[PDB]
Structure formats: C-alpha cells, structure tokens
C-alpha cells in the first residue's frame, strides 16, 4: 500500500514461547519494501512499544504513516502523544502474519544451530538475515536493497 519506502508501515506484537516464557516480539514492516524490524521484549506496555518503535526507526528510518491493531499499548495516551509530537499518522485498519512466520522460522533455525547461545542472538541473526540476505521474488532484491 505504501508507494515508496517509509510511506506506510504495519505493526503488531506477536508472541514467542522460549523456555517457558512468552516473549513479545514487537514487529514493524514496511508495506512497500517488506523491510522488517523486530524487538524481543518481555512485555508490551507503552514503554516497550515506544522503545521497539525507536529501534525500528533507527534501523529503517522514520515512517510517514503507521497502521496497527487496537491493542492498548498502541491506543495509550503515551503512544498517541509520541506519534502526534513527531508527526507520524496513526490509523488502526497477510504482511505482518507472513513476516511473523518467516521471522519465527529463522529464529527456530538459529536456535537449533547454536543451542548453547542466548535468544537475543537468534532474534538478531533472524532479523539481519531476513532484511539483508533473503532474495525476494519477482524483484531479485533483498528488503534492504529495496528499502535503502
């Protein structure tokens, strides 16, 4: 739906069980490039949501428009004030699901390749692998090449 990179992003929190803890993967994806940010958090309150959103922006640039679900972190006064103050349009009207699934498959593969190592490493390598290594179809480009 975005017409160029950083026009319109989609965001949701998805859940990932590892060692009997259910982590909150905060996931943002550009609707034009398919480029992704994901932050592994223990929670999904406004303090973690704003934080993941800043991580995403540091990696992808500032979006003009974000679309989320009606989850309460996204509807909090803290998140609306953030978006208003920094001129980010926020609406609340599949890309994220499909991106979640690709993330989780890479995350699982990296956990098994390196079982000794922390969850954060696997998330990181999943993230960078998807954006920079993965060649997309029909374009022949990576998300990173289309985005930047």
């Amino acid at each position: 739906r975005g017409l160029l990179p950083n026009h319109i992003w989609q965001g949701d929190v998805t859940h990932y069980k590892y060692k009997k803890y259910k982590y909150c993967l905060h996931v943002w994806v550009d609707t034009f490039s398919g480029a992704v940010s994901v932050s592994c958090k223990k929670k999904e309150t406004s303090c973690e949501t704003i934080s993941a959103f800043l991580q995403a922006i540091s990696l992808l640039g500032k979006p003009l428009h974000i679309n989320t679900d009606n989850g309460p972190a996204f509807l909090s006064q803290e998140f609306q004030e953030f978006c208003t103050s920094y001129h980010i349009k926020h609406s609340t009207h599949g890309l994220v699901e499909r991106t979640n699934g690709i993330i989780k498959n890479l995350l699982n593969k990296y956990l098994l390749d390196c079982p000794n190592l922390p969850l954060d490493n696997a998330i990181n390598k999943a993230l960078w692998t998807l954006n920079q290594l993965n060649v997309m179809n029909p374009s022949g480009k990576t998300r990173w090449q289309i985005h930047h």
Copy 2:
C-alpha cells in the same frame, strides 16, 4: 558555522546526576545539521574521550574540524595525537548548552516513563529521538534528514 554536514562540530562534556553518581555525558553536535552524539561515561579522561569521539564518528561520519573547550582530556597528548594522525583540525574557541538541555529533558522524560529500566536505555532513546524524530524549525526536517 559549518557549511555542510561534518564540516565543523562542537564538543563538550556535561554532567548528569543519577542515583548519587555524576555521569559525564560526552556530547558532539554538528554545527550545520544540529545532529548529535552523546555517550554516557563514568569519567572524562582521554580514554573515554577518544571512545565517545569514535562513537560519535560511527554515528555521524568523520568531521573535518572540531571545536572544544580547554578541558584537559581535549588538551591531552592522546587526544591531540588522535586528531593529528587522522587529519581532524582541532581548535578551542548556545549550540552545545541548548543541545545538553534538550538531551536532558528527553532523558528525564524517558526515565519517568520507564522507571524500572537502566539509565543507558533512556540515554539511547533520548539520542535517537532527538536525531530522528524531532522536527526542526523553519526547515521542517529532522537532524538525521539534514545530516545524511
């Protein structure tokens, strides 16, 4: 005073009290874009000054010319050798104060939003928020957009 990004930077150390420790915020700011680096350090010796300066350069690019105060870390043989070896003009002739103040206000806001979380997180989110989110006047651009 700089004519384009990375022509001339201003640098100083400012102090920030948190939990009865006075941290040294090493702050560099581009005089053209207003783009900022800040590193939270426990000290301001040459080893920390060179380190913050490398953090700044990794984030902003290499400057042609830096201007500092006469603080001893900046006048150390270690810092002069660094600047000489890598062809960075160093002179020792408000932008930093005003930038300090904006940093500290964002840092305080993030500490109160997230009281449970470490100082480093608040510094980081202050830093990225100021460079990438904040829209400057009359230009309508962020520091990041002007700088890069």
Copy 3:
C-alpha cells in the same frame, strides 16, 4: 580484485591471545575498498562463522563473491548451505594478513590506553578506527568513504 565495493571479499580467522585465552578473530575484508569487519569469538565453528559473516554483512553490505581458505567452518555443510541459499559465490583460492596486522596493532594500542576496560571495547575501537579514521594512500580516502 573486486571491481567495486561488495564484489569480492577475502575472509580468514586469525588468533589473538589475551589473558591466556586464544580468541578467534573472524576477519572479512573487501578487496576493492579495503573495508573491514572483525568479530571476536571464542571459537571458529560454523555457528560462530555464520554469525561473524552476518555481523560483517550488517556493517559492509552483502557481497557477491567471497574467497576463503579451506578451514572446516568455511567448508561445513552449514556455511555452504548459507552461501547457496542467499546467492553468495564461494571460492577457496597479502590483504587479510596485512589487515590482521593493522587490526592487532590498533587493538594492542587501545588495550594499553585503557588497560582497565574489556577486550571487546578495544576490538570495537580498532574496527571503527581502521574503517573510518585511517586515511589510505594514494587515494586520500578512508575505507568507509570508498566503500559507502
């Protein structure tokens, strides 16, 4: 041998003794820009090799072609599958040695400047110093300027 940045990289693991432990510096260098990645690892199995290679790619971009020695991490089924899946040509035919030496000299200098601080800090500052600060001859440019 590369005709522009990210055409052809050279990679090897070199060893660095610090406090009676022999670390594995995984080193990648672009044959055109001379730009470098180095990751300090405890080991050189496929899990660490793929990880250092992702660190390198995050910093330098995705290469078309990599050349390594016949070390077993590079010949592992895991590393060949990685290269095949993401369309990176891998051959197994001085740049790395000379780069190792420059890295190690900067690493030693930073350890002595800051003896109190961890090895990882010295590696990091060595890495960024070499890519961004060091002016190369006859070009007058840093590795970073040529690469990006």
